[PDB]
Design a protein around this nucleic acid. Structure first.
Lengths: 271, 46
RNA sequence: GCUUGAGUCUCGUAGAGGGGGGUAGAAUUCCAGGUGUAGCGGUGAAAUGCGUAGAGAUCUGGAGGAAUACCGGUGGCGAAGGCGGCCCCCUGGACGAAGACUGACGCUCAGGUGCGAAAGCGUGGGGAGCAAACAGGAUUAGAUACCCUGGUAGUCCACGCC
RNA sequence: AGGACCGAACCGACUAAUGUCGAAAAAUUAGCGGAUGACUUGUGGCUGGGGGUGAAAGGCCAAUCAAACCGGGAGAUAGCU
RNA sequence: GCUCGCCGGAAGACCAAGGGUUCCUGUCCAACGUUAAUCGGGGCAGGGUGAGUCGACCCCUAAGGCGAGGCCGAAAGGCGUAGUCGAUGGGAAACAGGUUAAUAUUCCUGUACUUGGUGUUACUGCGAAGGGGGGACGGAGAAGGCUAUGUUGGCCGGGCGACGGUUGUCCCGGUUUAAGCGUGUAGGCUGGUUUUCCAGGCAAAUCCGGAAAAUCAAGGCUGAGGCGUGAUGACGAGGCACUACGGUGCUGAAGCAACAAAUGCCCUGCUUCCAGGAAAAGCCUCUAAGCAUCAGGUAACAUCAAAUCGUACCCCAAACCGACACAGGUGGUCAGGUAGAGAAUACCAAGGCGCUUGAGAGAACUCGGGUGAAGGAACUAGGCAAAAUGGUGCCGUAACUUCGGGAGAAGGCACGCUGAUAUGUAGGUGAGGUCCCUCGCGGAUGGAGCUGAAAUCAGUCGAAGAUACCAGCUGGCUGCAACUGUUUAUUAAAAACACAGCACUGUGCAAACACGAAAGUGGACGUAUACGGUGUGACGCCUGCCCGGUGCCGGAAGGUUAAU
RNA sequence: AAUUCCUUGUCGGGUAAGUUCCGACCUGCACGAAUGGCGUAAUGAUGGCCAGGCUGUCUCCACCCGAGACUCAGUGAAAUUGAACUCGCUGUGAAGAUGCAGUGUACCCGCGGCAAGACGGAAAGACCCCGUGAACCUUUACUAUAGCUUGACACUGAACA
RNA sequence: CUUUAAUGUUUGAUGUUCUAACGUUGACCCGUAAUCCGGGUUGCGGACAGUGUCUGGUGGGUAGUUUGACUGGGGCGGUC
RNA sequence: CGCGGGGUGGAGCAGCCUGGUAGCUCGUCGGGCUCAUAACCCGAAGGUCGUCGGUUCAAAUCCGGCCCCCGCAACCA
């Protein structure tokens, strides 16, 4: 939910923290957790491949099953957990044969309800089945790109993909950006959009609220020196240039879509 | 003032050690020249 | 205490009364393909715009958003504002019928509180049409007006404010 | 609860003075600022010379940086002293 | 040796790091020490480091490195899989006294404990590179109960004191005791047990998990300290005894209570919020492949083994690092008496030192400080520097505002000591006694003793009672930037930068982009409420006109147009 | 005005006195709306101005207390330096003289002091200029180039319409 | 010679279909307790993609250099 | 000091470059439209081409001097 913090201090007078009183304050499931070390921009070569990433807090990796391959098994929800690695919360689920597994939680998913996968499940937010057994126009998420991969699109908070039309072994989708993409019909999806829709309303407030988060301060080029950044220069904020990236390629208007092997799947570009 | 040499036995041998040199070709290029001058102290070791 | 006050209970009636969730066709705009040709659009006249890269026109398909022809009436409901394509669920008020029942529980009401079209504002989405501001072209002594070609905010929606 | 307040250890270094062949190749003295956080700090690694790093000064990379140090091109070249 | 002075949350006592005999002793003084030197971290010779329980090695693992094959690349080489290393992490086991010129949780005395080999006996099914559990964890805040430790009292030993008093409400000193074992508390956590079934855990499972039932209401687990024991033992003030006059031998009383009280312990807890807080192994436990009169497992007892290496000394400094015996820097533990909020500060205990040039003079001048008539910024670039304000409780507090603040705004009053309320109060702790009990480390009840604010009234000393150290200058106008924060290490700490926020634009995932000849990684084990770039930079009111020049994007018909 | 050259513009306020400061007037050399505009509580080792309080900063310093300076003994440097029997003045001169000329004056030599000179000592000027010097950086300076992008050829083929 | 109609033939520009090349950072099994890799079935695209060669365009991201002299000092202006 | 540009009817501006002929709007005079003015329609005049000389067949024009005005420069220590 949305709750404005009282203006007691400079740095707190703009903090709006999300209150979700349904998340279990207990300890997250041990077997479903393994470590994920930080790297912060570093890579194989040890260079800072990507800027503004590092520091931050320590967070353990959660195993979220996107495949959901188990068929014909009702799933009794156990509880709603909080998730550091994802903006979307995860719901601890218990299957009928006694196995604990995590799933991305849809909108109306309370502690204890039931969901099921396979093509035997009716329409309830949380059900999983191929889109060649879905009503044309259904709001879904966690859709996959290849038949059996697991899921690539519509996974963030309040994300939903609208199925436009269906022609044979190809489903005319409408991704969140609005870019019409024809994906193979043999791909499993999950009904109902992801809840947690007040995530957008969250406003940090403190610079430290971003520091322990994992971000790193971004320095403008207008302040740097020409030897380090293409903008810099001048004794008094001079510009006179076409805004380009730290590596010469022009920005603020420069399409870089050169795939060729996936051009056939884009009906209309995002707009 | 923290002078530019805070001693450490362990770090010295992990970056200037004998066997540390026998790692790469460049390292064996070092001892080639070290033995070339007939220097008694091949590398900082024990 | 008794009833001609008021209110309640039993049965029905009409209704754009309100809230939420779905649904339909006509029409307009946009895109792609086929047919096809020099104008189209517009006005008091004209021009900008649009078009020989082939529009407009016509036909087919598809994606969108808003409003609901005819029925519609100085008709109906509601305190007022205001509310109309259809359907489901939840639900308010008024009216009539023949009786019973409690026994004046009534009326109004500074302050207070609540509702409240449009315009406007904030946060998050939507964006077809219309259209402040602005722009070009005319008219004109001047036109930062009336006309015409476009067009952002807004107009729509959920939650709040005024 | 708080990038909250006063204030030691701690970290840093704004003012003044001493010092400048100094006690010291940036410190002492008397006051300062932060002091539960974007904090400080030990041990142990990774990134490297037209490259690294950078809350961006062209500052930092072993007292040396608008391009480190060492060896070799090289006794480079010098219409200059 | 006797006084004085100094530090004392250090200038103390020990470890890690890092040096490498600087430690101890004898002898010597040329060289070393900014002076002499019989002195010494200097020269010369000799001695000293004793471990199953400390550390490391070792079992295991992270960041990250190497890396059989392998992918890729002129070669070198780069990367990476299984593996294998790598602690600052986790994992078995000892405490006390004595002893040396120097070393000791290592030697000795006394008393315990851990991990394996082997053998015997009584029983029984054991058994992996595989499963599950456990290990196993964040920050902050509050609280209960103890301990370290300290003061007072009781008791014990000594004294009764060179100037007036001191046999008593007097003075000084001591009043120490662990690991383990046993009971198993304060407190905390979780509902136990039995039966059946099962698409679950790469196979399998009696282990775990799920789903149905039955019985009863507890059981189990975790857990400082105390009490006993360890210990009719050690130590022990002070004497008794020999002096190489340094020390050694012998002997030896009291050894309890109460209160206060940690940041140590319970706590690797509990509550709460969010940014959501290692892995593996040891341990425990279950099976596959199989082996079964076995091998092995469990329990007791006996014996054997516990190796290798470091161990000296310094360790906030003359021994490390700064060329020096250098006013510098260096992580961690313990850390007492009084006042005091405190680890501040002042003075002291333990303990360790007077800093390796002194003796005179007291000139100008210089550095560090004190005080100063009348005036009070008249100084000067400028209130720079000094001065002054400075504690606690309470009285009281404006413009403006985002209604949190501003604010400790400003400005003031009372603070010592003694007595009385009250042979020291409220409050806190809490023995004895009494009763009961599913009987113990229990609960009510009861209140001695002890410890001990503050408030009110009165009296009295001084000029001054927060009397010392210590300890805010404030108000008014206003530019700029929001703010805490960051930077030119070594002349610039700011209005420069960062900042949450806002905006635009790029990107449909083998994503954009970046490193890299490539592979492969980062992005992200994330995916449009996401990520990269750029610009501005809290919030509030707002963000107008121009598409000529330039760039980007869209449409491609025509003219021009390379290779072929 | 962090911007106004002219200029200390003009009016009003604060002072006895105000090139600063504060509030306005618009003649804006040359403010202006995300290279964001105008305001803004709080914060600030920030900038400028003012008052109270309090003081040696000042009128003008005076004294006292410690460590040096000073004397004695011990130990014992450094920067620099062609050579010196190393005076002032006037003039002259590679153009500001201790040294040449003229003249005056002055016993030889120490210690403590003070800094006008010896264009004192230190840095083969950092200012200016030169060199057909270097180094970085800028772009619609010239020529190349990574990257990106375009088409053809090859890996790469069969079909009908 | 121009306009032209059919057929044979010759290359070329598009469209769609197809699967063997090839891509496959999809699933499954094995080597194998190994998220690398290799291979085998299968699935999805598809003669594209990607790469080598040649070539046009862009290109201060990057590299090597140029950027005149005389001049009552240089600069500006002017001049040769 | 130096460089560049301009001066044309009453006003505001073309024309120059590539020498002979001067244009547009407003304004003024006069007429009409209306009761009247403005506006509108119609007609016409008005320019020493800043200033003087020179070159040339010919000067607004090309060059030079001078005057006025505008912009730039008026510098690095």
């Amino acid at each position: 939910a949305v709750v404005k913090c009282k203006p007691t201090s400079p740095g707190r007078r703009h903090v709006v923290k999300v209150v979700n009183p349904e998340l279990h304050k207990g300890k997250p499931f041990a077997p479903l957790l393994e470590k994920n070390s930080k790297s912060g921009g570093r890579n194989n070569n040890g260079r800072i491949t990507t800027r503004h990433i590092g520091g931050g807090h320590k967070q353990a990796y959660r195993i979220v099953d996107f495949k959901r391959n188990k068929d014909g098994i009702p799933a009794v929800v156990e509880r709603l957990e909080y998730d550091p690695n994802r903006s979307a919360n995860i719901a601890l689920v218990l299957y009928k044969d006694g196995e604990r597994r995590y799933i991305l939680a849809p909108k109306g998913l309370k502690a204890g309800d039931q969901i099921q996968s396979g093509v035997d499940a009716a329409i309830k937010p949380g059900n999983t089945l191929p889109m060649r057994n879905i009503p044309v126009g259904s709001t879904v998420h966690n859709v996959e790109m290849k038949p059996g991969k697991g899921g690539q699109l519509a996974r963030s908070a309040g994300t939903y993909v609208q199925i436009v039309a269906r022609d044979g072994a190809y489903v005319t989708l409408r991704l969140r950006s609005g870019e019409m993409r024809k994906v193979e019909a043999d791909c499993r999806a999950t009904l109902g959009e992801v809840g947690n829709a007040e995530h957008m309303l969250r406003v940090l407030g403190k610079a430290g609220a971003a520091r322990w988060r994992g971000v790193r301060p971004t320095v403008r080029g207008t302040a740097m020196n020409p030897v380090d950044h293409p903008h810099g220069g001048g004794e008094g904020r001079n510009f006179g240039k076409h805004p380009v990236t730290p590596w010469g390629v022009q920005t603020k208007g420069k399409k870089t879509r050169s795939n060729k092997r996936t051009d056939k799947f884009i009906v209309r570009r995002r707009s | 003032m923290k002078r530019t040499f805070q001693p450490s036995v362990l770090k010295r041998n992990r970056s200037h050690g004998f066997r540390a040199r026998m790692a790469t070709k460049n390292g064996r290029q070092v001892l080639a020249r070290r033995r070339a001058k007939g220097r008694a102290r091949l590398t900082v070791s024990k």
